[PDB]
Ligand binder design. Sequence first.
Ligand SMILES: [K+]
Ligand SMILES: [K+]
Ligand SMILES: [K+]
Ligand SMILES: [K+]
Ligand SMILES: [Mg+2]
Ligand SMILES: [Mg+2]
Lengths: 31, 306, 112, 90, 119, 116, 75, 54
Amino acid sequence: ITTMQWRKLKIKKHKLRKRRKANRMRVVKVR
Amino acid sequence: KYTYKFKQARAVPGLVYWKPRTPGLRHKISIDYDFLGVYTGAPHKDLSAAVPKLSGRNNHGRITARHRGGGMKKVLRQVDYSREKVDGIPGVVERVEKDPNRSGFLALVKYQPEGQLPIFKYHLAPAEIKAGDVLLSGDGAPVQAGSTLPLRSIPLGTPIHNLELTPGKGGQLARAANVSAVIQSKQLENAIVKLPSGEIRLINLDCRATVGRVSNHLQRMINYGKAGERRKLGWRPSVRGIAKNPNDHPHGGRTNGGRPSCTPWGVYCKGQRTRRRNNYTNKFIITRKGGQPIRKFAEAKKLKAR
Amino acid sequence: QNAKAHLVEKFLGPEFRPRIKQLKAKRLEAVNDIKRHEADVSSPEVRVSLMTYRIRDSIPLFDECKKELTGMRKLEIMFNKRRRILRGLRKHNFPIYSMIINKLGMRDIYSD
Amino acid sequence: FRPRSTHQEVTEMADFKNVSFLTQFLSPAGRIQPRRVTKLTEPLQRRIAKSVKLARNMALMAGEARLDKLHLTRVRQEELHRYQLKKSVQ
Amino acid sequence: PLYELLCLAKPLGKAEIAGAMKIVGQTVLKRGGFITEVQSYGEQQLAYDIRRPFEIYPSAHIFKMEFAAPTDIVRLVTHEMRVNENVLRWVVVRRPRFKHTLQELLEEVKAQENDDFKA
Amino acid sequence: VLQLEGVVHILNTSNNIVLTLTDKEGRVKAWTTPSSVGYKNAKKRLPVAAETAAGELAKRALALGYSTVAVKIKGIGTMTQYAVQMLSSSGIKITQLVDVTPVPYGGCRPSRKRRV
Amino acid sequence: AFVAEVRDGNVDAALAQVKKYRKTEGVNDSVRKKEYFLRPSLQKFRDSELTYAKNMGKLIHERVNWVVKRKKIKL
Amino acid sequence: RLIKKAENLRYAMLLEESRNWIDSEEELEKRINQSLENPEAFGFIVDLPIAKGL
RNA sequence: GCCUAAAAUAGCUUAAUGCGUUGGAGUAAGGGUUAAAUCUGUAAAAACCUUGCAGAAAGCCUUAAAGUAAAAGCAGCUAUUCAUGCCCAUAAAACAGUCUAUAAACGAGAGCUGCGGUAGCAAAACGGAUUAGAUACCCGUGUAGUCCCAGCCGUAAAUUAUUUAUUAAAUUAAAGCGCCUAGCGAUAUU
Ligand SMILES: [K+]
Ligand SMILES: [K+]
Ligand SMILES: [K+]
Ligand SMILES: [K+]
Ligand SMILES: [Mg+2]
Ligand SMILES: [Mg+2]
């Protein structure tokens, strides 16, 4: 795998982690 | 700190995890004495006495210790904290028993002096003593758990318990479950000893102590599941100060906590000191709990006055 | 001063030796009945017997020391190997297979 | 040219008690010399290093030169003279 | 196996040193061993001073003992050293069982037979 | 009066140089530093500041009667060269130079590296 | 602890000996290591760079030494 | 056959060494007293003979 | 018989560092930056000689790892338990293989629960600067964590595909598998 391929995946993983933290302390999870 | 995961795991041996069949059994955790070999029957007839419950009332008949009374019948055991009587005679452990009046375990020891009948005594059980073991005291005894020797014949780093402040009165300092004390250094006529609470103190070298720790390592894993469990032990409920009316407590008014927290008699209870500044015993204390030097405590309001 | 022969015998004996050496000495003596001749240490009868004795001696060892994972893995490897050896003997040489099972008190569960 | 001990001598005298013998493999500051300087085999290199480390634990050697123990050289020579005289008389 | 004990004790009188040595010897004898060598080197000056909570020792008395006993003797000896307060520092090291290897013994046997064969 | 043997301790740790004069038992008699002479935050790192501090210490040492001194150096730096030379040229005799820089055998974890 | 005696007031000679002791006995190396912390994976890279610089210096002077030996160059 | 002879040779040598071995407390006290009365030199001066076994 | 940077278990050593540490002596700074300041001191600090207490880590040897510990990984000293590796001398008439559909065990660092400990370092946090802004990089304090014991979690840019023959490698031909079929796009459903 190349550096360019790593960077393309990096952005999507960041977005998923941010959303999960927001829903960590919510009654109704946003999905 | 109790957590519900701890009870679900059911890992630690020697504990009874009661299945949550009823609301009063869901959080109940007790001690399994049979699995540990601890006798839980009646005490020795010649070393016990039945006494009435006082319920925290003095000879004037008034309540001086609150939230007491209403439990089960009380029986007391006589324990020999000082083994000076039986110095030379070896003793054989017969049983390890449970006493509801203390948090440790007691050991029943039989001595057979030459030319006399057997003698029975109760002792505070060391950490690793079982039935059939041999206990010895006085000069000429090995440095092993269960041996009682003067401070002049104990190594520095060896944990000890049941320490005597006075030369022959008896052990008073380290008694609670799974506690110990250590010796840091020995001077001309005193030894520097660290107590279970973290205090450094001077103790005369002619005092005696027992090698080892106390014999109950499951004390902090207990959880009473019901209010009635502690009622059977002799404890009564208490009411919060802010729930009372003004004529009963300083917090009585409708508002909650109008003034800083205090005792029912108005003394601040979130840090105010109660030991006497000029106490005669300041000559034997080097460092108080938390690391405060004795001089800092002894001379604190005198500087403010100046 | 006189010589003490009783001290020489103790030193040359198994008394002042590690536990493993003493156990291994007993294992060899226990196979004096099934070995082919006085110096047989490699026949299939001897090898299987020694492996079985090692397993029995190791059961108490790992009941106290439950964190020595390296030793357990070695034991597991030998455990599987002995099974395949017995599987081969049963298929090709039943009479030898029968003697090993009878001597060690095992069960005939080594078929395919 | 400097004295060199034979490998047979090293294997016979490589012990933590022989501080004098072990000194030949230490730098003037008191550190362990590498194998390329001692001219020893790998098994012999390990033994010498362990002997020095054990001697340090027992207070028979110091991890480095100490300013408060500079009179030991005088003491050792004085002890050596007495021992030689005693044995010679005997 | 064969063990060797090196002990650094305070520079006290002969009686105190003898008592410390005798304790170790009786421990070995009780367990079922025997003692081969007993030696003393007198008071020696150390590379650096041994420090106790309020004491400094620039010198010590050194003695050694060699004994043969079961593998359980090491813990017993270690306990005695810790309990005794006249001992400053100690170490126990294991030694080879035999002086001569099997190969060396065989060569001696072969040489003897050759002399007899020639005779 | 002038027949006094003393010790001069030089501490240099990449930011400042400290010179202390003591007797042979360890009791301090005088001490100097570049800040005590007039050189401040950024100017304390110059070789001129080290020379001035060394000269001032020598003057006080002579007044007290210390003419023969031994120098103990702790740390690795460039200021030690100038301080020692100034002491010698100021009229104080130097008999020995001793290096006592410590060396941990393992030790404690240093701080992280500056990502400048 | 290195002790350098001063003879005939030659302080500069004593200073030269002190520097030699630090380099020979590894005092400068200890100071460099303890200035700041590096992970074992980052310490490995640092050691590789230092060895590479040493090897390049060795190679350069190996070429010069051959020229001197053959052509007897007085450098 | 030769190995058996070697074993017997080792046994014979150990018997000679056993003459100076101590197993009784009476001998232990005598050995301790003699050792204390005749101190030896340590490795700081003369190399010591390191034990190799029995 | 010996050896071991192997694992588990138990004893021991201290160079340096920290402090609401002891006594002596002494007096204005110490610390830090591209340049400064916050901060620590003058009510007696730092520096120097001494006293006490404490945790973590292992200089030279020391080098790859050449041990390869199965991989994850592994060097302060001594001993026990156990598993390897070396020499020297032996042993087997019939038995022992490769690969893995399925199944199980081990498994860095971070993280979670309980117990003990807490020097140094350091997410977060709070101040001083830099800058158009600095919500970052720099400086000063500093809690979890890093440490011990018992459990949970099973994730890494967590090594070169495995085996037979040849071969220094390589190359050539075979045996049993897993995975890919343009990219892009889900917290889909189960
Ligand atoms: K209440
Ligand atoms: K109120
Ligand atoms: K992990
Ligand atoms: K860190
Ligand atoms: Mg009301
Ligand atoms: Mg890796």
